[PDB]
Amino acid sequence: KETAAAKFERQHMDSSTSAASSSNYCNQMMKSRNLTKDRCKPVNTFVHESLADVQAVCSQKNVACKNGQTNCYQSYSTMSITDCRETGSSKYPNCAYKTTQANKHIIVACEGNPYVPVHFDASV
């Protein structure tokens, strides 16, 4: 199994690029991060900032999660992100994604010691 923290890193972190490199970015990343294995994960966001900067969000603006949980945090600053969403004729195992680049505040839920992100809630 995966720890919640490692799963967040696998699904949501891409510090290797400043932004999506092409229209094919989500197709490549959704596959290589193993998010199309058992099904097409419908929606998923990658953050193009350092892991340290994203972990730091857990000490930023405490806000409610979409489901009412109280352990969500919004980044004080905007961050480079890419939204990946199933589109077109996406049918498992032929998964297909729309790549949408943006600069937005991220909202994550945090847990544990160290207190680190364990769920991507939304971006604003």
UniProtKB/Swiss-Prot annotation:
Compartments, as annotated in UniProt: Secreted
Keyword set includes Disulfide bond: yes
Subunit text: Interacts with and forms tight 1:1 complexes with RNH1. Dimerization of two such complexes may occur. Interaction with RNH1 inhibits this protein. Monomer.
Catalytic EC class: lyase
Tissue-specificity statement: Pancreas.
Parent-protein residues present: 27 to 150 of 150
GO molecular function terms listed in the Swiss-Prot or TrEMBL record: lyase activity; nucleic acid binding; ribonuclease A activity; RNA nuclease activity
Primary location: secreted
S-S bridge residues: C26-C84, C40-C95, C58-C110, C65-C72
Active site: H12, H119
Family indicated by similarity: Belongs to the pancreatic ribonuclease family.
Species per Swiss-Prot/TrEMBL record: Bos taurus
Keywords: Disulfide bond, Endonuclease, Glycation, Glycoprotein, Hydrolase, Lyase, Nuclease, Secreted, Signal
Gene label: RNASE1
Protein name: Ribonuclease pancreatic
Annotated glycan sites: K1, K7, N34, K37, K41
Effect of H119A: Loss of activity
Role summary: Endonuclease that catalyzes the cleavage of RNA on the 3' side of pyrimidine nucleotides. Acts on single-stranded and double-stranded RNA.
Binding annotation for substrate: K7, R10, K41, P42, V43, N44, T45, K66, R85
EC number(s) stated in the UniProt entry for this protein: 4.6.1.18
GO cellular component: extracellular region
